[PDB]
Design an enzyme around this catalytic site. Sequence first.
Site, PDB file in Angstrom:
ATOM      1  N   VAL A  50       9.505  36.500 -13.533  1.00 48.64           N
ATOM      2  CA  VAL A  50       8.677  37.239 -12.588  1.00 48.64           C
ATOM      3  C   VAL A  50       8.571  36.461 -11.297  1.00 48.64           C
ATOM      4  O   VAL A  50       8.259  35.281 -11.349  1.00 48.64           O
ATOM      5  CB  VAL A  50       7.248  37.491 -13.131  1.00 48.64           C
ATOM      6  N   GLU A  89       8.176  30.605  -5.246  1.00 55.04           N
ATOM      7  CA  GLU A  89       9.553  30.198  -5.480  1.00 55.04           C
ATOM      8  C   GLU A  89      10.327  29.988  -4.166  1.00 55.04           C
ATOM      9  O   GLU A  89      10.083  30.627  -3.136  1.00 55.04           O
ATOM     10  CB  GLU A  89      10.328  31.249  -6.274  1.00 55.04           C
ATOM     11  N   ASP A 127      26.226  11.649 -18.955  1.00 61.16           N
ATOM     12  CA  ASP A 127      25.879  13.057 -18.831  1.00 61.16           C
ATOM     13  C   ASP A 127      24.888  13.211 -17.685  1.00 61.16           C
ATOM     14  O   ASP A 127      23.696  13.360 -17.885  1.00 61.16           O
ATOM     15  CB  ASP A 127      25.406  13.568 -20.199  1.00 61.16           C
ATOM     16  N   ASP A 186      10.222  18.249 -29.884  1.00 56.73           N
ATOM     17  CA  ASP A 186      11.502  17.874 -29.317  1.00 56.73           C
ATOM     18  C   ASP A 186      11.811  18.791 -28.137  1.00 56.73           C
ATOM     19  O   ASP A 186      11.201  19.847 -27.980  1.00 56.73           O
ATOM     20  CB  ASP A 186      12.590  17.933 -30.400  1.00 56.73           C
ATOM     21  N   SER A 187      12.792  18.398 -27.320  1.00 58.53           N
ATOM     22  CA  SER A 187      13.460  19.308 -26.405  1.00 58.53           C
ATOM     23  C   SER A 187      14.571  20.054 -27.159  1.00 58.53           C
ATOM     24  O   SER A 187      14.775  19.792 -28.353  1.00 58.53           O
ATOM     25  CB  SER A 187      13.912  18.546 -25.173  1.00 58.53           C
ATOM     26  N   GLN A 211      17.917  23.492 -26.782  1.00 59.70           N
ATOM     27  CA  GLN A 211      18.854  24.274 -25.987  1.00 59.70           C
ATOM     28  C   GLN A 211      18.110  25.008 -24.879  1.00 59.70           C
ATOM     29  O   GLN A 211      17.087  25.623 -25.137  1.00 59.70           O
ATOM     30  CB  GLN A 211      19.693  25.239 -26.834  1.00 59.70           C
ATOM     31  N   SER A 248      18.279  21.394 -21.431  1.00 55.15           N
ATOM     32  CA  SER A 248      19.357  20.529 -20.967  1.00 55.15           C
ATOM     33  C   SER A 248      19.333  20.362 -19.454  1.00 55.15           C
ATOM     34  O   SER A 248      19.163  21.343 -18.741  1.00 55.15           O
ATOM     35  CB  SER A 248      20.664  21.064 -21.368  1.00 55.15           C
TER      36      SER A 248
HETATM   37 CA   LIG Z   1       9.033  33.097 -11.032  1.00 54.61          CA
END
Ligand SMILES: [Ca+2]
Length: 223
Positions: free
Chosen positions: A57, A62, A84, A171-172, A174, A177
């Site tokens: 949204v 932003e 990485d 945890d982090s 998918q 990343s």
């Molecule tokens: Ca937004």
Amino acid sequence: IVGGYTCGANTVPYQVSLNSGYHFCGGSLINSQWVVSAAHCYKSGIQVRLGEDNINVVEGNEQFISASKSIVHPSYNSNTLNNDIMLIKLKSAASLNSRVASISLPTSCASAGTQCLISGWGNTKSSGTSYPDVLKCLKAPILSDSSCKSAYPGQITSNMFCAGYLEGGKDSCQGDSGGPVVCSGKLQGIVSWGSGCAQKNKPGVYTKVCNYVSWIKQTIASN
Ligand SMILES: [Ca+2]
């Protein structure tokens, strides 16, 4: 992020979403023109989205800016995920404000036991799939190298560290990343890899940002 909490809108002002028609990775804003992410998040046609909370949204704070260039680390190995790390340059400078702010690079590496903040829009389940719309956060400690190496025998290089909980549950995951691991107000890690998410004896593995500060500074001074 599995077993985390809702950050609160724009409380992580350096967090970015990388979008190629859909959110696919996180990143960290390190100055008005540069984002740090994971090399394994490389693709062409990246739009950087800053000042996001709900990624689905438009809420009014932003800034959407196209990447002009992506620079993968010259020694990145996609098989082992050694090195990485990738830099993304924005086509125009971000307007820095209270909702969109840079995170400092480290001058020195972080210590085992330090509680860090990991953030992102990735999967919130350890089994199954549920993607959140708002930014999630996790406090997690840096583990000793001995425990990290024990968890992933033969796979941990000096450019990696482990953070999280050996008991599992937090945890982090998918979709997180490339995003930030911030410790004592410095970007010390990048979400990199792990065996599944929030599994017992399988903590998160993070790119060790303090090893790359020279490369980052040199690259930014020439591009
Ligand atoms: Ca937004």
